[PDB]
Amino acid sequence: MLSRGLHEQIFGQGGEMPGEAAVRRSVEHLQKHGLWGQPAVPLPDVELRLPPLYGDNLDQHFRLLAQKQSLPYLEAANLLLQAQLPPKPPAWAWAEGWTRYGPEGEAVPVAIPEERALVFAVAVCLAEGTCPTLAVAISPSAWYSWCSQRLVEERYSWTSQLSPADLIPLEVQEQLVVGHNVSFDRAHIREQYLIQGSRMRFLDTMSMHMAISGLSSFQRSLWIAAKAISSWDWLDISSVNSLAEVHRLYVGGPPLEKEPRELFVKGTMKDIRENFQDLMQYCAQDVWATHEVFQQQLPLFLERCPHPVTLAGMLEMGVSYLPVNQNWERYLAEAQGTYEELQREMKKSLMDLANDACQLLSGERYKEDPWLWDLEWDLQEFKQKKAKKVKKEPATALGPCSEEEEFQQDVMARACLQKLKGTTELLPKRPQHLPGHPGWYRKLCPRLDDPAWTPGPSLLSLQMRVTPKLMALTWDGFPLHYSERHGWGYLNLAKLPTGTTLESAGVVCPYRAIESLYRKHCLEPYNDVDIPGCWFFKLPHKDGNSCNVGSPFAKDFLPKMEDGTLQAGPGGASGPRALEINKMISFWRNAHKRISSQMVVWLPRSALPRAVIRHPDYDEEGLYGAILPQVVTAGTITRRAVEPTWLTASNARPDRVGSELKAMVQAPPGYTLVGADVDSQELWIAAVLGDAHFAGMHGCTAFGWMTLQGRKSRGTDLHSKTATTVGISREHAKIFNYGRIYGAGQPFAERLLMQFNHRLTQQEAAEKAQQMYAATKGLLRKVQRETARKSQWKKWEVVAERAWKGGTESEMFNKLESIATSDIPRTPVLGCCISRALEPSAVQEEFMTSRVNWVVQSSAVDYLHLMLVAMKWLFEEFAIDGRFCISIHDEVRYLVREEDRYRAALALQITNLLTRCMFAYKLGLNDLPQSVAFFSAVDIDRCLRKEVTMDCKTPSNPTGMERRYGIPQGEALDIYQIIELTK
Amino acid sequence: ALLEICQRRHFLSGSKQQLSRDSLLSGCHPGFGPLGVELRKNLAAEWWTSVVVFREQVFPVDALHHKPGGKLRENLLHGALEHYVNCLDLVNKRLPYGLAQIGVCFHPVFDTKSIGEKTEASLVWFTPPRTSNQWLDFWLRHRLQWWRKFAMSPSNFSSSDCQDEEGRKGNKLYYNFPWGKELIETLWNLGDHELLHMYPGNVSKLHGRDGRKNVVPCVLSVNGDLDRGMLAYLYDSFQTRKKNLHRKVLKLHPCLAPIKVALDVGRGPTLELRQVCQGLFNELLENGISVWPGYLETMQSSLEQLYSKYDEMSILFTVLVTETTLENGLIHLRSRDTTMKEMMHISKLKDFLIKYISSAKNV
Amino acid sequence: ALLEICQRRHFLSGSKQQLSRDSLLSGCHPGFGPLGVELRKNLAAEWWTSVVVFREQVFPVDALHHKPGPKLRENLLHGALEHYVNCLDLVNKRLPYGLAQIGVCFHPVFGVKSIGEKTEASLVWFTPPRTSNQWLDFWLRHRLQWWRKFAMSPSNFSSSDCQDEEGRKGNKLYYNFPWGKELIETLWNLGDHELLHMYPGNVSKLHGRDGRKNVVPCVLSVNGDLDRGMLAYLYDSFQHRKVLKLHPCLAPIKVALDVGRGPTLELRQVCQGLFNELLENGISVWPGYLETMQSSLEQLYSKYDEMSILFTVLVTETTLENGLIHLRSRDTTMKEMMHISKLKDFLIKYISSAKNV
DNA sequence: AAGACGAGGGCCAGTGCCGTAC
DNA sequence: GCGATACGGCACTGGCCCTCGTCTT
Ligand SMILES: Nc1ccn([C@H]2CC[C@@H](COP(=O)(O)OP(=O)(O)OP(=O)(O)O)O2)c(=O)n1
Ligand SMILES: [Mg+2]
Ligand SMILES: [Mg+2]
């Protein structure tokens, strides 16, 4: 009720828009495809009084919302644009706080630069960071320079107080702060860490550059290489995200000089004061260049991104807020402890193996070792120069008692010892590494004159290249090797020749111990090359490899390590345990710097909600604080968020060490976070782009009908329907599908599905070939399919027809290619044109995949922005405290309070409904299916995580530590209306 | 189960043949050799460092071996419990606070009528009821961490979570001997029962300031058998397939290793400026590093003999003084972990040893 | 008035009737306080250090407490005599050699009669009969000097000579209190009769090599008391002032640091820093910065002087600017000021400067 | 006695492979 | 014709350059 999926809506009375011919085509298509076995399972319709609409459509609704949200900031931006500039001061004031430079650059001591808008770039001495040290900010009126409290030499104690720069004005509109990577500067703002607030938003020239004239990483690689027929035309129309480069692009003036000494990151606080004036000058140059860049970008961005939803969305997407406490510090300590322990064990075992294998140097018995014969095995004993002389060999030159009368003979032997000691020093010069030990052992040791010297062979690894060959047995064979690739593995007769000969002089090789090792292995070039395992003699060549890259070292083959082949020796379960240890510390190894240095400001009891103090939590002399994620508003592509730490934050896995990082963001007492993850966005996006193209309805496609048919709760989604084939649930099937939409390469899908399902390649190939039915078919000498009914002809001039390309049957890649063909905007809907570097006008373009992905992911990001502005609209309109946003692409979580959580979740549901209805309206019809209108899962709890139930590794007991639980949602939240008076 | 000969030959234990696993696990052994009591000495010292010194609120306690009112003490927990009030006074009633003591305890054993003694290191941790379990898990992880280091294969040391007959939580620590796991340390949470029974009159002298309020202390307790632990490290030090070549050597941690370095005389014979060995000797012992003297000898044999002799004594390094070193000043050095000849300078050798041990204490 | 400042400063255990000198000299206790325990540990450490420098080689051992045949030990001789034949292998029968050990021996103290404990340090030196007396005199001098080094007065320690039909020559080290000179250490020259009683026969194992000569060794019995020695140095350190000037290398707690400025977290941070730094180099530091009130300075100094603390450190608010810290000596009571960075080196150099004989 | 070629080690950026998220 | 957008890590390496050594004038 009706039309195979719709709800009670007041978003337009008319309407059909029947398209009887089109729906006959669609029905016939879906019959021959064929799907005509409807389950007839109507989802429970919801009857609630919707929030007031402003008319006429929801388009003007979101437009007026986005405009009324971004109007003051646009005004401030315009104030920055028409700003007439007063020149830089002749000298910078060496005074704490802000210094205003107005007429002739006079120094006027100010606490807070009262301005509507300003550019900003903070400085911070990395030597003892991360506390601000300098800052410069220009305004449409005059100049400003802020100096930190680091003007007096003291023995400071840094617990990250409210020492960051003060920028906001007190009440008892309003603000806009622009800057290159403005999030970093925002992180150094005093009033941004407060639980409440804030009016001040931020605009990023880097993100804006990315929106206007951005380029992919693959482009960045060959862009900087400038130092594929028409692939170099966009080279001068775009640039990298660097400030100097983006200024050279948008301003095109003289090249701005950068600090040659890198004093802020390389030097101490001492050499900063010595060059204070110069550093201040450089900072001023930075804020000036950024000012210019902004001035030239704002109208360009306004042109390229005309819809205000993108603007306001980018405004709210830049003020993220992560509340934390002492549990953060405890987390750091415990995680680093566990990491150091596991690393200690691993390095202990490996250095043990490296110690007990060092003994077979005497005498020349290392050649017999089938693993250790490539390396050095050097024996050095240098050196000395003659000074003593002459002409005599220096190489050869039971009594019971109780005497003590020689009391001071000990000081005689002591004096002789010292006098002997002091004479040898001028014989050697510089202390070299231990020459007695072999070279492989020398390299595997820390230098003697190193401040971080540890005894024995350190620097063992995991993932080094010496140590795995040092101990491991090799796939039903004996030797591992490396050259262009390590020991081959994972990611009509064929024959090859053999050859053995002797010349010299080259390292001896042994091929018997290998065969004997194989004998011992089976005691329990050809043949045995395809499925079994063996090693030849010399060559070296492929002779039976599947992967085209190699893998040093086998670090994710636990199922191939815990099934016999392959194993290690000596010995036992040491191998799989070592792999386990590696897998445990894999995350924290490549992240610990980003989380340990992840700064955080603590707000004292003087500046926190007293209503939270009233709440029965303090907690026991506990410290409350927060950290702003420091997120670049728009990083390619499409204008997605970019953040070094939190966007690549691992999930709740009981295997990884720091896997609790996601769930360490704990809400303050009285507060709780409510969020949701769109399920699913890009899939339904491609679906809609298909059905809306084919006809009017949403279920008029072979692919688009299955997307809006499944429910995750006690049911089966499309991903889940592909995962139960079988099939692997569920993220893997997601990768397979989303990989299929953007290029289901036969060998890619092959080794992928084969990697995930773990079976034999033939049956797998059958599965792929069956699943390859979706992209089929497609289009002098050519592919045997054209617009003509048959390809065969004689002297038939048809160069005018070879201009159409389109797949057939199930999928709708034709529409994505249709958006990928237009030489102009290519923006659906909304609605923002990207990259002067990918716009096919004056581009070859050969960047197709990136642009299909651009289209769908753009729909995803505009979905994100729509969600942001929608959530913001009914959060200020109604009494829902806590408007702070924390978004991760698909997912988005707000920091609400315990008494306004269900209404906030209701706001999330309304938001999702309105956004889906927007995507439906931009293509028609305004009508939308049932199992896609509302969210299925709304997370509501203290710390943010994935599933409502959460286990972890390091703390071992989650609720053991001061925690709570989560709640699935749901249908029970659809009883609390947006009005304050509920329950 | 054949390293015992290495323990007899090189006295880390008694030369008596009757040293069964039962006689070693009961404490009815005739005693330990000098190298053994030295190993246990460094082990107990390493305990005292990583339990008492670095952690504040922990003070040494001296419990007697008997009672004023014949059988001796079974555990040195109660003797430390008797010292609760004064130690409360020296901490200004600031709990959590602990009392630590390493003393030999006497256990009655019916051999299937005798009594066996064994050195035990005990810490009694007086902690508020609000945070009892937290401190229990704390000490669990930390003790287990302390025992899982110094080991060549830390996998052998395990922990077992167990409850009492009434319901009191507790944790045991095991070491995987070649014949199975064996108890080496125990951690229990005593719900202020014994303290209540010891002071029935005025319980006001038991109240400890938890912070904003004075509460009755819950008595955490950790007791570690250092004899079974010394034997555990003894077994762990010794080596196991397709190595193709084997040498008898036990790999003890450089921190707890009985004899650190071994000084000898090479080439040999050389008279009579050999008094420099005495210099290096006193210089070495002055820095607190163990040095074995290879002066008066009957061998006069293959170097492999005394090299293996030192490897059986877990000696870290073998410093060799020869007449060429008497000329220039560069003595020989053979490491234990990696049997390899290496040249070095004298004071450089001293500082190398000090830095070696000190850094071995670290990561 | 010394026994009372050992009760309030936790050198001895809490007692009200068994606090007398007679009950202290007796093994009966009221055990020991943390300060006394650390003092005994440092004393025993210096004891083991003053015999490890002794050439050629003396092996440490441990003896059982109860009876092997079913009782508690009185002396620390038998257990050392049981490990003689074994250590013979380790000395390779080459020369005279000794066995040192520190243990808690017992003795009956006299209603009913009880049992007292004492921690004694013994050294059993096996030496040829012809060179036993000379070595006994050697150990006499070395032990006397050992007591003399940490002594505030060498005249307080004395050495007496004696002899009998069972022991041909012996020496006993006394200590003047001066409420009465008391036994502190015994140095006897027992024959092989003690050893020939537990190994007959066939006594062919007992005789060690002595310059191509086989000879059953005479047994030197060193037996010192570390408890009586502890009390000795306690009475040796007692000097309106009431300050115990124990030896720097002997003092249990050698430094203590508090705060002066009103209770601030930063002060505790700095103090924890100095705490860790000083403990990193093996320097016992008393934490009085906890604190909680920091009432007075004079009574605090009195407390730290009754605990024999070498130096007291004060971390004011100026330290959070210039790094300067308020040092205060004990032997001179000079209120000094020095940078916090140069404190470790100063204390270490000061302790190392007390290393002389 | 001064000058020039040669060998060893630190600092640098570049590259290959692995690791996480959506 | 095709995984896509990021984000970092460590292991390895060829190259610039200072330092010490050593042969040469
Ligand atoms: N390997 C991936 C993972 C994700 N995405 C894109 C596609 C969708 C978008 C959001 O990611 P997910 O939420 O993980 O996909 P989903 O289908 O929405 O999953 P769910 O139904 O659980 O929300 O990111 C992608 O392109 N490639
Ligand atoms: Mg999703
Ligand atoms: Mg997602």
Side-chain angles (χ1 to χ4, degrees), chain A residues 640 677-682 719 730 734 738 742 890:
Chain A
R640 275 197 172 185
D677 183 273
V678 182
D679 36 25
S680 59
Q681 48 171 209
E682 287 203 12
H719 300 269
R730 184 182 180 268
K734 181 187 302 182
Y738 281 138
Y742 314 143
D890 188 303

Side-chain angles (χ1 to χ4, degrees), chain B residues 50-288:
Chain B
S50 182
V51 171
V52 180
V53 183
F54 285 163
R55 297 183 183 85
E56 62 278 352
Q57 297 173 340
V58 177
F59 304 95
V61 59
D62 183 35
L64 289 315
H65 298 258
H66 70 276
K67 282 297 190 62
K71 303 178 64 177
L72 290 315
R73 57 174 182 181
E74 295 181 353
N75 58 82
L76 67 172
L77 154 128
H78 182 79
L81 258 58
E82 297 175 350
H83 292 64
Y84 171 70
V85 179
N86 296 267
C87 293
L88 252 202
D89 181 89
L90 76 88
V91 80
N92 203 338
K93 294 182 175 298
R94 295 193 305 268
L95 88 174
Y97 96 99
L99 303 183
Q101 179 189 2
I102 308 181
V104 48
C105 289
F106 307 87
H107 297 56
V109 43
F110 289 159
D111 185 90
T112 58
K113 58 193 63 180
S114 180
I115 167 251
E117 64 179 47
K118 48 189 175 183
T119 297
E120 300 179 346
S122 174
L123 166 66
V124 43
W125 185 258
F126 304 101
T127 168
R130 182 189 59 88
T131 172
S132 294
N133 306 123
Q134 298 188 1
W135 278 112
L136 177 54
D137 179 85
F138 174 87
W139 284 116
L140 168 64
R141 296 183 292 101
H142 279 253
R143 296 267 71 256
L144 182 56
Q145 183 272 347
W146 180 88
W147 235 293
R148 272 178 176 175
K149 56 178 178 178
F150 311 120
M152 208 56 55
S153 61
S155 177
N156 289 330
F157 301 92
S158 63
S159 63
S160 180
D161 298 30
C162 52
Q163 60 180 2
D164 210 29
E165 51 271 356
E166 287 291 338
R168 299 176 177 88
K169 288 295 182 297
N171 295 271
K172 301 186 180 66
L173 270 69
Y174 299 142
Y175 171 74
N176 189 81
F177 281 105
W179 57 89
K181 300 188 302 178
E182 214 73 22
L183 182 60
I184 60 178
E185 190 170 45
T186 171
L187 290 80
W188 282 94
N189 190 29
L190 313 173
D192 62 90
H193 174 54
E194 188 62 30
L195 285 194
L196 256 52
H197 182 264
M198 286 180 57
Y199 298 86
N202 305 330
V203 300
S204 180
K205 62 167 64 67
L206 262 54
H207 286 173
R209 298 204 306 262
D210 181 30
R212 307 92 177 267
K213 60 273 173 184
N214 51 331
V215 76
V216 41
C218 191
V219 189
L220 195 59
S221 173
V222 40
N223 185 90
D225 197 319
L226 292 191
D227 285 348
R228 287 187 175 182
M230 187 269 293
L231 266 297
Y233 285 159
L234 201 55
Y235 273 84
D236 182 87
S237 59
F238 191 80
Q239 298 292 337
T240 166
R241 181 49 51 232
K242 63 102 48 216
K243 84 291 272 66
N244 295 17
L245 214 65
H246 233 358
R247 52 180 278 261
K248 41 172 53 185
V249 49
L250 16 72
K251 299 175 177 295
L252 286 169
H253 196 280
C255 273
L256 41 74
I259 295 185
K260 308 301 181 183
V261 85
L263 181 57
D264 296 84
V265 167
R267 312 296 91 181
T270 299
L271 293 318
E272 223 302 284
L273 295 179
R274 204 87 289 104
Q275 55 183 355
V276 59
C277 297
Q278 180 71 17
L280 185 63
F281 187 71
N282 70 265
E283 178 191 6
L284 258 44
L285 56 79
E286 271 173 356
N287 289 97

